[PDB]
Design a protein around this nucleic acid. Structure first.
Ligand code: MG
Ligand code: MG
Ligand code: MG
Ligand code: MG
Ligand code: MG
Ligand code: MG
Ligand code: MG
Ligand code: MG
Ligand code: MG
Ligand code: MG
Ligand code: MG
Ligand code: MG
Ligand code: MG
Ligand code: MG
Ligand code: MG
Ligand code: MG
Ligand code: MG
Ligand code: MG
Ligand code: MG
Ligand code: MG
Ligand code: MG
Lengths: 67, 88, 129, 271, 70, 106
RNA sequence: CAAGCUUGAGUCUCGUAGAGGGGGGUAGAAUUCCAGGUGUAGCGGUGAAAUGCGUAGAGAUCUGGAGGAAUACCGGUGGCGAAGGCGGCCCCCUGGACGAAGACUGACGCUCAGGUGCGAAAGCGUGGGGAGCAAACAGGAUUAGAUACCCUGGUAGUCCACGCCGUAAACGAUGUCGACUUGGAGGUUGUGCCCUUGAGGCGUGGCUUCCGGAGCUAACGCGUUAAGUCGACCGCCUGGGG
C-alpha cells in the first residue's frame, strides 16, 4: 500500500536545511515518526533521523511541542 | 590510512612496472609504510585496542610474507630488508 | 583449508547418490581421473569426461538402478592424517568380495581383486560398495 | 613526574619524588633575588609565637610579580625555575622592552609561550586581565582582593578559582576551599590553573625530610604534663577531656572566625 | 498535547481531543515506563518476547487464512 | 584540504555589523587559498526554542573548500566570541553550490 | 629437490553502508540542590499503615543559578565488532567488512600445545567527581520470629584519569577452516539489466531472522548460518558426591 517518498526522486542525502519534508515527518509533539507508519525506506530513515537532529540542534525545528 | 599517491609511489620503486601491485616485495613495502604511519597514531591513542588489532594483522601479515621471500631466495630478501629498514 | 581432494571426490559421489543427481562436477586431477577410471571399469559409474585446459573439471555421470543408489556406501581409508598401506596378503575384502577397494600400487590405481592377482599390494585409497 | 624510589635503605623505601625535567638547572636571575633570613617562629619580642618552625635549608627570596601591571606589553617565557619559597614553580618572562619578571607558572605554560596583560589581552593561559573582561565560567588564578593590591588567591601548586557569576561592580568566585565570595570587577586575575599540580603527590619519606623544610617535631599534648598542656598527663595513657589547643580553646569543631567587616562578601561558607 | 479551543467547540469534544492527543503523544505510556528502572537484560528479553509473539501471530494469520475449517 | 560548510547564528540585536563579520572570516580563509563556494545571509529568523532568553536570531550559512587547520581557528573565534549565539561546522562529501530550498522560497 | 600453473591465500584501482574504535567539543528534555516571589495545611507513602517532611511555612506553582549522569522519539529477531561489547549531533585520528570491472604475486595456505594480546559487571590502588540510583547501616511496618520481601533515609560503589584483577547462564549452553547436499517467505547492504516510460519486473553477491524436506538425533529438535555428508587440526569427557 504505502511507498517511500524519497525513493520517487533521487536523493543523495537528506538535507537538514530543508523544512519541507521535515515538518511532516515530525509529529505535533515534536517527536519523529517511525518508518512503520510513514512507509519510508530504512535507507533514508537513518538520514531523516540525522537530518531532524541537526535541524533541532540549529533551532530550525523543535525538540518538543512546547520548546 | 594510506593514500593513492603514497601507495602508487612506493609500488613504483619496489615493483618493476607500475602494474606490479601484487609482488611480494611491494606488499611488504606497503605494509611497512602503513605500520610506521600508525606508530604515530598509537603513541597517543594507547587505548585504541580495536585499531591496534588491525595494526597487528598487518604486522603478522608482513612476517608471513617476509618468511615466504626468505624461503624462496635469500638474495632479494636481504636486499629488501636493508633498503626498507627492518631487522630480521 | 582444502586438504583431501580425494575425500572431496568421494563425498560428491555420496551426496549426488543421496540427492538423486544425474551428474556431479569437480576439479580434475591425475589421481582423481585414475579413481574414476577404476569405478568406470568396475561398473559403479556411467561415464566420466574431462573438459577444460587451464582449469580441468571432472564431469561424472552417476549411475542408478531402480529407485536406489548404485553405490551403497563409499568411504575413504587412507587419509592425510592417517596413511594406510597394506601388503599383498593383507588386502581387505570389502563385503566378502562383492565390493571393491581402490588400491594405489606401483603399476597403477586399481582394485584389490586385480591387485591381489597382480601380486602387488599398496595404499588403500577407498572402499566402494 | 611521580617517581617512586627503590627501598635501598629505610628512609628511602617510602619516598615519592616529584621530578620536573623542564625546571631550569643553574642559578636564578640575580637582580630579582633578595635575602630572607629565617625566624624560627619568633616575633620581635623573641618569643615563639608559632610553634614547630626552625632550621631547614637556607633560601633566597624571588621577587615574584603578583600585580602584573606591565600592561600592553607582550612577554616571552624564558625559563621555568624552581622556587624554594612556594609550592608552585615560577617563570622568568622577558618583555619586549628588556624587562625580566617572575610570574607564577600556569598549568599549560612552557618556554617560548607568549603572555600578555591589559584590558585587551587575549583569553589564554598566563594572560592577566580584570574579571570584567574575563568571561564567566572560566578558570582563573592569582586573583587580587582589591584593585592594584596584587594577586592573593589561588597561588598554591594546583589551585584556581571559578568565575561563576557577575552582577554590576562585583563578580562571584568559587574558591578552592569551596565557598562563594564576591570580589570587585576591577580586580585583575590570570587565566588558567597554576601548574605543578603533581606537588601533592609526593611523600617526604623520612623524619628528616620535614626537617629540611624547616618543620620541627610536634609533641602531642596528651604526652605532656598537666602544667604544660591542658591534655596534661596521667598514669599510663589517660585522656579524659575534650580536645583543646595548648591555650584551652577546644579544637575538633569550634569555629574561630569572627570578622563582621568582611562578612558581606561571603556568599556561602565552605562545607 | 497543547490544544486551543476553536470556535463552536463544546467541552465534550475539547476533552475528547485532549484524551486522543494523549495517546497519540503516548505520554502516559512513557511515564509508566520510567516509573521503574528496567535492566538492559530486561528490555532485551521483553523486546525479544514481543518480537516472537508479533511474528508468531503474523504467520498464524496466514496459516488460519490458508487452512479450511468445516 | 576537504569540503566543509559552516552555519553560524548571531545575536539578533547586533545584526548591523553582521555583514562585516562575513568579510573578516572569508578574508581569513581566502588568505590560506580557501574558497567560498556558497554564501546565503538568511537574516531575520524566529527560533523553534528560546536560546539565551531570546526567540529571534540572524542566520548565516556558508560553504568553504578549505584546508584542515584553517577551520580550527574559526571555531575558536566562535567559542570566545559573544556575537555568535551558536556555531556549526560539517564535513561535506562534495561541493554544493546550489542554493537552499527555504531561501529560494523566501 | 628442480621448474612451472592459477582455481586457494593475498596486493592495487573506484565506490557503499555501519551505535566499529580512541580524543576533543557541543545541544535539548528531565532529576536534585541553593536564592527569592505567591500561597496554606498538608505532603509523601502503602494491601492497610507507620517512620519521615511541614505552621520555625512544607508540598504545589513561577523566575534565576550551580552541578553531575544518561542520551526520549528515530529504534527495527535493524547495523557494526574476534569476543566482551558499541545509541544525542558535530569535528580530528583510525581498524575491519562487502560489491563492480580489471591488473598483479604465484600455494605465500588451514589449524595450533606452550606464549602473547583483548576480555561485562562486581572488586582493588592513587588522585578527582558525586545529580540520580543504591550494597552496608538506621528507623517504620509485616510476621509466631523477619538479620528479608514493602516504606522513609542512606555510605561505599556506579562517573573520569592511570594501573591491577581475568572472572560470568563470558550462551548459539553448538571450536576454527574447507567442500558437497531439495525448497519458501522476509530484513539489511551492494550491483548488472530490461518500452529504464512510471509510484514496474528479470539477475547477481555479502550479511541476517522464520518455517520446513531428505538426513541425522535418546527425544526435544537441528535442518545450506546443520546437530546432514565429509576431510585438517586443536580443546575436552569417562558414575553421583568428596
Ligand atoms: Mg604544626
Ligand atoms: Mg605530625
Ligand atoms: Mg606527634
Ligand atoms: Mg610524661
Ligand atoms: Mg610523671
Ligand atoms: Mg591545666
Ligand atoms: Mg594525658
Ligand atoms: Mg600520659
Ligand atoms: Mg606516668
Ligand atoms: Mg592505665
Ligand atoms: Mg575512662
Ligand atoms: Mg580548658
Ligand atoms: Mg517545594
Ligand atoms: Mg566497573
Ligand atoms: Mg575505585
Ligand atoms: Mg530501599
Ligand atoms: Mg554476554
Ligand atoms: Mg569458565
Ligand atoms: Mg561453556
Ligand atoms: Mg586461528
Ligand atoms: Mg527448523
Amino acid at each position: 500500500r504505502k511507498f517511500c517518498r524519497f525513493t520517487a526522486e533521487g536523493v543523495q542525502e537528506i538535507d537538514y536545511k530543508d523544512i519541507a519534508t521535515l515538518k511532516n515527518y515530525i509529529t505535533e509533539s515534536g517527536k519523529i515518526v517511525p518508518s512503520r507508519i510513514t512507509g519510508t525506506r530504512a535507507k533514508y530513515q537513518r538520514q531523516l533521523a540525522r537530518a531532524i537532529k541537526r535541524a533541532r540542534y540549529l533551532s530550525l525545528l523543535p525538540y518538543t511541542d512546547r520548546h | 590510512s594510506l593514500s593513492t599517491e603514497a601507495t602508487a609511489k612506493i609500488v613504483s620503486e619496489f615493483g618493476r612496472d607500475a602494474n606490479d601491485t601484487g609482488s611480494t616485495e611491494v606488499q611488504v613495502a606497503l605494509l611497512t609504510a602503513q605500520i610506521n604511519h600508525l606508530q604515530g597514531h598509537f603513541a597517543e591513542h594507547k587505548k585504541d585496542h580495536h585499531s591496534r588489532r588491525g595494526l597487528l594483522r598487518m604486522v603478522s601479515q608482513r612476517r608471513k610474507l617476509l618468511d615466504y621471500l626468505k624461503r624462496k631466495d635469500v638474495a632479494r630478501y636481504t636486499q629488501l630488508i636493508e633498503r626498507l629498514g627492518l631487522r630480521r | 583449508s582444502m586438504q583431501d581432494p580425494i575425500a572431496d571426490m568421494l563425498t560428491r559421489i555420496r551426496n549426488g547418490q543421496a540427492a538423486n543427481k544425474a551428474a556431479v562436477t569437480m576439479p580434475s586431477s591425475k589421481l582423481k581421473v585414475a579413481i574414476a577410471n577404476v569405478l568406470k571399469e568396475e561398473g559403479f559409474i556411467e561415464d566420466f569426461k574431462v573438459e577444460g585446459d587451464t582449469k580441468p573439471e571432472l564431469e561424472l555421470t552417476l549411475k542408478y538402478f531402480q529407485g536406489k543408489a548404485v553405490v551403497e556406501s563409499i568411504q575413504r581409508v587412507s587419509r592425510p592424517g592417517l596413511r594406510i598401506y597394506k601388503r599383498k596378503d593383507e588386502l581387505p575384502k570389502v563385503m566378502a568380495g562383492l565390493g571393491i577397494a581402490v588400491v594405489s600400487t606401483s603399476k597403477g590405481v586399481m582394485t584389490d581383486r586385480a591387485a591381489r592377482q597382480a601380486g602387488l599390494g599398496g595404499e588403500i585409497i577407498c572402499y566402494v560398495a | 613526574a611521580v617517581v617512586k624510589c627503590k627501598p635501598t635503605s629505610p628512609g628511602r623505601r617510602h619516598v615519592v619524588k616529584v621530578v620536573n625535567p623542564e625546571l631550569h638547572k643553574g642559578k636564578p636571575f640575580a637582580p630579582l633575588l633578595e635575602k630572607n633570613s629565617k625566624s624560627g617562629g619568633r616575633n620581635n619580642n623573641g618569643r615563639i609565637t608559632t610553634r614547630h618552625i626552625g632550621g631547614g635549608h637556607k633560601q633566597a627570596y624571588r621577587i615574584v610579580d603578583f600585580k602584573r601591571n606591565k600592561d600592553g606589553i607582550p612577554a616571552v617565557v624564558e625559563r621555568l625555575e624552581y622556587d624554594p619559597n612556594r609550592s608552585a614553580n615560577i617563570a622568568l618572562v622577558l618583555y619586549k622592552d628588556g624587562e625580566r619578571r617572575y610570574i607564577l607558572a600556569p598549568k599549560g605554560l612552557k618556554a617560548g609561550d607568549q603572555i600578555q596583560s591589559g584590558v585587551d589581552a587575549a583569553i589564554k593561559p598566563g594572560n592577566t586581565l580584570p574579571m570584567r573582561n574575563i568571561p564567566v565560567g572560566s578558570t582563573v588564578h592569582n586573583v587580587e582582593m582589591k584593585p592594584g593590591k596584587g594577586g592573593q588567591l589561588a597561588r598554591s601548586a594546583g589551585t584556581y578559582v571559578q568565575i561563576v557569576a557577575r552582577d554590576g561592580a562585583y563578580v562571584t568566585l568559587r574558591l578552592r576551599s569551596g565557598e562563594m565570595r564576591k570580589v570587585e570587577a576591577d580586580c585583575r586575575a590570570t587565566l588558567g590553573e597554576v601548574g605543578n599540580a603533581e606537588h601533592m603527590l609526593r611523600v617526604l619519606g623520612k623524619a628528616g625530610a620535614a626537617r629540611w623544610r624547616g618543620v620541627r617535631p610536634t609533641v602531642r599534648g596528651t604526652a605532656m604534663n598537666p602544667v604544660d598542656h591542658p591534655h596534661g598527663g596521667g598514669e599510663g595513657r589517660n585522656f579524659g577531656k575534650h580536645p583543646v589547643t595548648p591555650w584551652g580553646v577546644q579544637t575538633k569543631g569550634k569555629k574561630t572566625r569572627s570578622n563582621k567587616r568582611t562578612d558581606k562578601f561571603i556568599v556561602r561558607r565552605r562545607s | 498535547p497543547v490544544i486551543k479551543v476553536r470556535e463552536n467547540e463544546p467541552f465534550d469534544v475539547a476533552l475528547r481531543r485532549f484524551k486522543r492527543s494523549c495517546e497519540k503523544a503516548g505520554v502516559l505510556a512513557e511515564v509508566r515506563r520510567r516509573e521503574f528502572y528496567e535492566k538492559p537484560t530486561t528490555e532485551r528479553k521483553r523486546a525479544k518476547a514481543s518480537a516472537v509473539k508479533r511474528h508468531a501471530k503474523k504467520l498464524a494469520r496466514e496459516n488460519a487464512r490458508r487452512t479450511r475449517l468445516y | 584540504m576537504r569540503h566543509y560548510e559552516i552555519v553560524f547564528m548571531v545575536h539578533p540585536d547586533q545584526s548591523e555589523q553582521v555583514p562585516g563579520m562575513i568579510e573578516r572570516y572569508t578574508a581569513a580563509i581566502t588568505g590560506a587559498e580557501g574558497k567560498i563556494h556558497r554564501l546565503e545571509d538568511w537574516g531575520r529568523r524566529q527560533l523553534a526554542y528560546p536560546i539565551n532568553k531570546l526567540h529571534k536570531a540572524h542566520y548565516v550559512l556558508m560553504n568553504v573548500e578549505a584546508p584542515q587547520e584553517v577551520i580550527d581557528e574559526l571555531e575558536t573565534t566562535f567559542r570566545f566570541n559573544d556575537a555568535v549565539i551558536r556555531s556549526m561546522v560539517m564535513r561535506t562529501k562534495h561541493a554544493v553550490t546550489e542554493a537552499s530550498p527555504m531561501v529560494k522560497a523566501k
